[PDB]
Design a protein around this ligand. Sequence first.
Ligand SMILES: CCC[C@@H]1C[C@@H](C(=O)N[C@@H]([C@H]2O[C@H](SC)[C@H](O)[C@@H](O)[C@H]2O)[C@@H](C)O)N(C)C1
Ligand SMILES: [K+]
Ligand SMILES: [K+]
Ligand SMILES: [K+]
Ligand SMILES: [K+]
Ligand SMILES: [K+]
Ligand SMILES: [K+]
Ligand SMILES: [K+]
Ligand SMILES: [K+]
Ligand SMILES: [K+]
Ligand SMILES: [K+]
Ligand SMILES: [K+]
Ligand SMILES: [K+]
Ligand SMILES: [Mg+2]
Ligand SMILES: [Mg+2]
Ligand SMILES: [Mg+2]
Ligand SMILES: [Mg+2]
Ligand SMILES: [Mg+2]
Ligand SMILES: [Mg+2]
Ligand SMILES: [Mg+2]
Ligand SMILES: [Mg+2]
Ligand SMILES: [Mg+2]
Ligand SMILES: [Mg+2]
Ligand SMILES: [Mg+2]
Ligand SMILES: [Mg+2]
Ligand SMILES: [Mg+2]
Ligand SMILES: [Mg+2]
Ligand SMILES: [Mg+2]
Ligand SMILES: [Mg+2]
Ligand SMILES: [Mg+2]
Ligand SMILES: [Mg+2]
Ligand SMILES: [Mg+2]
Ligand SMILES: [Mg+2]
Ligand SMILES: [Mg+2]
Ligand SMILES: [Mg+2]
Ligand SMILES: [Mg+2]
Ligand SMILES: [Mg+2]
Ligand SMILES: [Mg+2]
Ligand SMILES: [Mg+2]
Ligand SMILES: [Mg+2]
Ligand SMILES: [Mg+2]
Ligand SMILES: [Mg+2]
Ligand SMILES: [Mg+2]
Ligand SMILES: [Mg+2]
Ligand SMILES: [Mg+2]
Ligand SMILES: [Mg+2]
Ligand SMILES: [Mg+2]
Ligand SMILES: [Mg+2]
Ligand SMILES: [Mg+2]
Ligand SMILES: [Mg+2]
Ligand SMILES: [Mg+2]
Ligand SMILES: [Mg+2]
Ligand SMILES: [Mg+2]
Ligand SMILES: [Mg+2]
Ligand SMILES: [Mg+2]
Ligand SMILES: [Mg+2]
Ligand SMILES: [Mg+2]
Ligand SMILES: [Mg+2]
Ligand SMILES: [Zn+2]
Lengths: 136, 58, 93, 38, 75
Amino acid sequence: MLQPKRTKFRKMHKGRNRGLAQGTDVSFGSFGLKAVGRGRLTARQIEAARRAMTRAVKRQGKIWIRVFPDKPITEKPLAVRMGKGKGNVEYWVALIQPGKVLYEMDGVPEELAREAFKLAAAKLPIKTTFVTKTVM
Amino acid sequence: AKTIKITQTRSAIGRLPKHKATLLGLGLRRIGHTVEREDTPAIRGMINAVSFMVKVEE
Amino acid sequence: FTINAEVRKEQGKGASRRLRAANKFPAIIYGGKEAPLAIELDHDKVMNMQAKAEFYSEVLTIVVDGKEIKVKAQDVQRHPYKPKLQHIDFVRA
Amino acid sequence: MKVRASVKKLCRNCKIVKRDGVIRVICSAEPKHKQRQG
Amino acid sequence: RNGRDSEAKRLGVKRFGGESVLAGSIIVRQRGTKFHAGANVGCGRDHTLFAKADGKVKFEVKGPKNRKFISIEAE
RNA sequence: GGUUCUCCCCGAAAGCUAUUUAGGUAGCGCCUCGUGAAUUCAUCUCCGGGGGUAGAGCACUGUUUCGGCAAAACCCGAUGCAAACUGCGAAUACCGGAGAAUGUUAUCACGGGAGACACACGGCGGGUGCUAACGUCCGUCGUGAAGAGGGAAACAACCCAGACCGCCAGCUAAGGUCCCAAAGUCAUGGUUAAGUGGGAAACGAUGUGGGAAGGCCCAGACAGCGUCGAGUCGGCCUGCGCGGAAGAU
RNA sequence: CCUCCUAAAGAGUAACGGAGGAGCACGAAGGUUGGCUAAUCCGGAGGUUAGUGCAAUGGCAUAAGCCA
RNA sequence: GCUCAACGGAUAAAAGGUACUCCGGGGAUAACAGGCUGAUACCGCCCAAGAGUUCAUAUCGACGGCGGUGUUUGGCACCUC
RNA sequence: CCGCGAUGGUAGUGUGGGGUCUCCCCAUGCGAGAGUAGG
Ligand SMILES: CCC[C@@H]1C[C@@H](C(=O)N[C@@H]([C@H]2O[C@H](SC)[C@H](O)[C@@H](O)[C@H]2O)[C@@H](C)O)N(C)C1
Ligand SMILES: [K+]
Ligand SMILES: [K+]
Ligand SMILES: [K+]
Ligand SMILES: [K+]
Ligand SMILES: [K+]
Ligand SMILES: [K+]
Ligand SMILES: [K+]
Ligand SMILES: [K+]
Ligand SMILES: [K+]
Ligand SMILES: [K+]
Ligand SMILES: [K+]
Ligand SMILES: [K+]
Ligand SMILES: [Mg+2]
Ligand SMILES: [Mg+2]
Ligand SMILES: [Mg+2]
Ligand SMILES: [Mg+2]
Ligand SMILES: [Mg+2]
Ligand SMILES: [Mg+2]
Ligand SMILES: [Mg+2]
Ligand SMILES: [Mg+2]
Ligand SMILES: [Mg+2]
Ligand SMILES: [Mg+2]
Ligand SMILES: [Mg+2]
Ligand SMILES: [Mg+2]
Ligand SMILES: [Mg+2]
Ligand SMILES: [Mg+2]
Ligand SMILES: [Mg+2]
Ligand SMILES: [Mg+2]
Ligand SMILES: [Mg+2]
Ligand SMILES: [Mg+2]
Ligand SMILES: [Mg+2]
Ligand SMILES: [Mg+2]
Ligand SMILES: [Mg+2]
Ligand SMILES: [Mg+2]
Ligand SMILES: [Mg+2]
Ligand SMILES: [Mg+2]
Ligand SMILES: [Mg+2]
Ligand SMILES: [Mg+2]
Ligand SMILES: [Mg+2]
Ligand SMILES: [Mg+2]
Ligand SMILES: [Mg+2]
Ligand SMILES: [Mg+2]
Ligand SMILES: [Mg+2]
Ligand SMILES: [Mg+2]
Ligand SMILES: [Mg+2]
Ligand SMILES: [Mg+2]
Ligand SMILES: [Mg+2]
Ligand SMILES: [Mg+2]
Ligand SMILES: [Mg+2]
Ligand SMILES: [Mg+2]
Ligand SMILES: [Mg+2]
Ligand SMILES: [Mg+2]
Ligand SMILES: [Mg+2]
Ligand SMILES: [Mg+2]
Ligand SMILES: [Mg+2]
Ligand SMILES: [Mg+2]
Ligand SMILES: [Mg+2]
Ligand SMILES: [Zn+2]
């Protein structure tokens, strides 16, 4: 389950999630799973998807994770009122914009890659599409 | 030196203060009010600023 | 590879988005002594061509008005998440 | 009968049929494969 | 454990380019030399730049370091 | 808590600062009346300015993945991320100058009289909260407050629009034109068959319309292929529908 | 009371919002003139990556750093 | 000459109890119920790790995903002091 | 005096309007950064 080893600060402003993604090409492998939707991916979701695709390929080829969950998300406990300081960090997320390549794969046939990424995509809260490396 | 006719087509109610100040600059007072003004870049810029609520007969 | 192109009349964001809504896309030819030439291309025709890998290696012919310009594809801007082309740079060969 | 939001062919003998506005899977081989969307 | 801040110091440019100023007039309040004192401009103990003559404020980028200088062009 | 006749003109605030202060009060801001005074003020155009926000980027400060290299450091190539990162950097906004037109001086100062210092919703930019709340806290604009009329069935705060009085005249705005109910059972070309329209997602499916390109195929395709006589297969993109869809008079 | 961020590129701007500091020190650690330039790695490389009496931000080689 | 630090500093000089209580007020502000919300709760669904001799789907459904209800614990303080 | 850079596209954005409104789109104006040709 991915998490920054350390951070300069513990808590982060909510912020917003506008714009299109940077890292829209299959840069490392042959095949990619690309976000077409917008949202947050938790470290748990990223891991669940990784396990699904890794099992599918049966330790064949190589898998890259292009996204890293570096944004800490706080929550307030049950039965506490508003205010009294910002809540405690509970989990980490990666902000996803449309076009973001999430995972890449190499060293498998395209049919197996499509199958593995289909099984991964079912774990994710964002709509995805299968992509391949281009010349340009 | 030519003039142009400018007519206010929509209400000033709820518009930005700068837009109301621009209508005042053109001398437009109410919906349907037509004024005759000299055709200059300064006048054209005022029309441009409130073009959504004026019509020009040039 | 032969590509029919028209010279662009309007330029900028508004013009470019209107092109793509009408199933065309903008492109640019530059290089050599001659000034750059901004062109419109048919989207489906070029998208089918550039699926072939020879499109990026080989010298292409762009037919603009009634003049055949030899070029190579220099850069492509793809749509972030759709199988579509936003823009192509062509260099004069 | 399996009543599911996701109905699909489970084998080669499964057939998708729409009956009275309902997607169904009918299978000549396996009664367990019979599905209705719902 | 938080909940503290200091009073805002009203730093920044007081007279912009081309403004006519009297001698003594403060042009910029700043922390350190974000701007430097050019012709007819003094630098106070808190790095305040002030006019030493009547004239118009002029910002300029000069030197090998490419530093922002403020001068007064005398009227 | 209550505060008694009439008409005319203007018309707030619910903020800042301080307060044994927090539903009080004071100065300032905003209202009003008077007096005085500059092309004083505003809009636009042009000119002179400083920006470090949006965006972007990764040299820096951190964070991050892969490969290479190698004391797994470092270094290099490749990939991202940042309110408290910036070797970049807008739009706007703001300050100043000049010029015209327009505006009942709209500006500033001084003086007489205040009220107000519980704000609300909506838009945009945000903190907080669960990008929960008709939630909470700022910035900024709008409306309500203190604003009637028309629209949104009904509906302070949304849309249109600012009611001096009278008219059994006319034109329009938003919104509408089959009947309730004023006005098209209007025209032309399409789509939908779900009463979809007139709640609801992941996801599921030979629903149905459009588009570009493929594979196979009269050396006979697609089920029959121990057969006869033209289409056939299944991806892609897109319009409109279908299931997913349980609540108490 | 100070520094940063929130703060929407002038100023200002709230919350029991996010992070840290102060209630001093110094007759030199002040004034001036002259002189000098760091971290770190292995004389060389490197160029402030150090230093600032103490937080943080903006500054500082003409050095504001450092010595007489 | 002030940790007058509650830092614009009521006095030079000050702690508590009240279920024995009392007055002026407030739905400006809590307890009940309503309302808004739906984190939580409850119910349903998607993917299919696997279990189930064999076999993912008779039955159960790990890692994760999407909803519905108003239905628990709560949030808010809009109505009523 | 103080050691880069078009064109085109993209991002953002003022004003007005719209949607399926956590985010976008349309009209109009402004228009980067990075990168490319090149210098
Ligand atoms: C958890 C309690 C919530 C409150 C209850 C209620 C209230 O005050 N009730 C009175 C009643 O007293 C008499 S009944 C003995 C009266 O007859 C009856 O009308 C009524 O006033 C008393 C019980 O305290 N409030 C409105 C809210
Ligand atoms: K001054
Ligand atoms: K007061
Ligand atoms: K007065
Ligand atoms: K607001
Ligand atoms: K009003
Ligand atoms: K219906
Ligand atoms: K006090
Ligand atoms: K007592
Ligand atoms: K009750
Ligand atoms: K369900
Ligand atoms: K079985
Ligand atoms: K009560
Ligand atoms: Mg922002
Ligand atoms: Mg636009
Ligand atoms: Mg039946
Ligand atoms: Mg403050
Ligand atoms: Mg500060
Ligand atoms: Mg009035
Ligand atoms: Mg004070
Ligand atoms: Mg940004
Ligand atoms: Mg920043
Ligand atoms: Mg001006
Ligand atoms: Mg008060
Ligand atoms: Mg108040
Ligand atoms: Mg309040
Ligand atoms: Mg307020
Ligand atoms: Mg908001
Ligand atoms: Mg509220
Ligand atoms: Mg809200
Ligand atoms: Mg009132
Ligand atoms: Mg009204
Ligand atoms: Mg009404
Ligand atoms: Mg009505
Ligand atoms: Mg009519
Ligand atoms: Mg109309
Ligand atoms: Mg009728
Ligand atoms: Mg008809
Ligand atoms: Mg319906
Ligand atoms: Mg549906
Ligand atoms: Mg500021
Ligand atoms: Mg600003
Ligand atoms: Mg304020
Ligand atoms: Mg305030
Ligand atoms: Mg504060
Ligand atoms: Mg005090
Ligand atoms: Mg006191
Ligand atoms: Mg009592
Ligand atoms: Mg209340
Ligand atoms: Mg309650
Ligand atoms: Mg099941
Ligand atoms: Mg589970
Ligand atoms: Mg409740
Ligand atoms: Mg409130
Ligand atoms: Mg009630
Ligand atoms: Mg009621
Ligand atoms: Mg350009
Ligand atoms: Mg550029
Ligand atoms: Zn079957």
